[PDB]
Amino acid sequence: HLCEFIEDCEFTVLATRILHLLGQEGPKTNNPSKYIRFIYNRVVLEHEEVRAGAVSALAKFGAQNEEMLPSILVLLKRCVMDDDNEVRDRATFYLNVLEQKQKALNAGYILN
Amino acid sequence: KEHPAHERVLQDLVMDILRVLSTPDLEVRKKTLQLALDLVSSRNVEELVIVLKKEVIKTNNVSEHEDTDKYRQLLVRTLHSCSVRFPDMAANVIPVLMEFLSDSNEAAAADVLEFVREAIQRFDNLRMLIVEKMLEVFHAIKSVKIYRGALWILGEYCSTK
């Protein structure tokens, strides 16, 4: 309900809060395809900023992986990628950051 | 124009004609600009450029742009193209300056466009000055646009360690 409605019940501000929370929660509650499905959408919206949250939430999530995620988790960041300079940069950088640590290690430091 | 035997001169006479444009009507003007761009094998250029600069001054003036603004953007496009081909010069520096003066996004977008481009183009030298120029501009200024500007530039970085 939240997901859907909020989508078409708007307000960016809400998203900030919820994002943050969601950010922690991920794969302890599974339903991956859906959740992904959502996540993509959330990003769908413009705003470098709106887009950005899906990646950040993801870090706790990614790290944990779910009912299918690690392989693919690795595949995805690749599949979804962006320019728009500082938006480019965000993709690049997260990557670059990613680039910079053994992704397993990477996850551990950053997450905390 | 498909008199592709296309004589030198003719291209050249344009400016004269173009002068008339100062008695505006953008829409007409606009048609001109496209038209204009074409002839230049990166030449009859300077005289023009100069003239452009004249335009530029003219553009300053006191203005109450409403139509001409548009023109400016266009001009810049028209202008942009040339440069690609050309080796260009001080004139260009001036845009940079000019741009600093200005206050609306579309230009920033162009600028940015330039950011991109230039990032590709790198013969560099100019940039550095400009970067300096910019440094001034920057010091000299505040805004989201700027704020954004900083970001990329910052991103870019080099010397004066």
Curated annotation (Swiss-Prot), chain A:
It is found in: Cytoplasm, Cytosol; Golgi apparatus membrane; Cytoplasmic vesicle, COPI-coated vesicle membrane. Oligomeric complex that consists of at least the alpha, beta, beta', gamma, delta, epsilon and zeta subunits. Interacts with ZNF289/ARFGAP2 through its C-terminal appendage domain. Interacts with EGFR upon EGF treatment; interaction is essential for regulation of EGF-dependent nuclear transport of EGFR by retrograde trafficking from the Golgi to the ER. The coatomer interacts with KDEL receptors; the interaction is important for retrograde trafficking of KDEL-bearing proteins from the Golgi to the endoplasmic reticulum. Interacts with COPB1. Interacts with TMED10 (via C-terminus). It comes from the Eukaryota. The chain holds residues 438 to 549 of 874 of the full protein. Belongs to the COPG family. The coatomer is a cytosolic protein complex that binds to dilysine motifs and reversibly associates with Golgi non-clathrin-coated vesicles, which further mediate biosynthetic protein transport from the ER, via the Golgi up to the trans Golgi network. Coatomer complex is required for budding from Golgi membranes, and is essential for the retrograde Golgi-to-ER transport of dilysine-tagged proteins. The gene is Copg1. This is Coatomer subunit gamma-1.
From Swiss-Prot, chain B:
Predominantly expressed in the upper one-third of the oxyntic mucosa and in most regions of the pyloric mucosa. Ubiquitously expressed including platelet, liver, heart, spleen, lung and kidney. Brefeldin A induces dissociation from the Golgi of the beta-COP and presumably the other coatomer subunits. The chain holds residues 309 to 469 of 953 of the full protein. It is found in: Cytoplasm; Golgi apparatus membrane; Cytoplasmic vesicle, COPI-coated vesicle membrane; Cell membrane. The lineage of its organism: Eukaryota, Metazoa, Chordata, Craniata, Vertebrata. This is Coatomer subunit beta. Oligomeric complex that consists of at least the alpha, beta, beta', gamma, delta, epsilon and zeta subunits. Interacts with CAPN8. Interacts with SCYL1 and PRKCE. Interacts with COPG1. Interacts with ARF1 (myristoylated); this interaction is required for binding of COPB1 to Golgi membranes. Interacts (via trunk domain) with ARF1 (via switch I region); the interaction is direct. Interacts with KCNK2 (via N-terminus); this interaction increases the channel-mediated whole cell currents and promotes plasma membrane expression of KCNK2. Interacts with STX17. Interacts with TMEM115. The coatomer is a cytosolic protein complex that binds to dilysine motifs and reversibly associates with Golgi non-clathrin-coated vesicles, which further mediate biosynthetic protein transport from the ER, via the Golgi up to the trans Golgi network. Coatomer complex is required for budding from Golgi membranes, and is essential for the retrograde Golgi-to-ER transport of dilysine-tagged proteins. HEAT repeats lie at residues 8-45, 88-125.
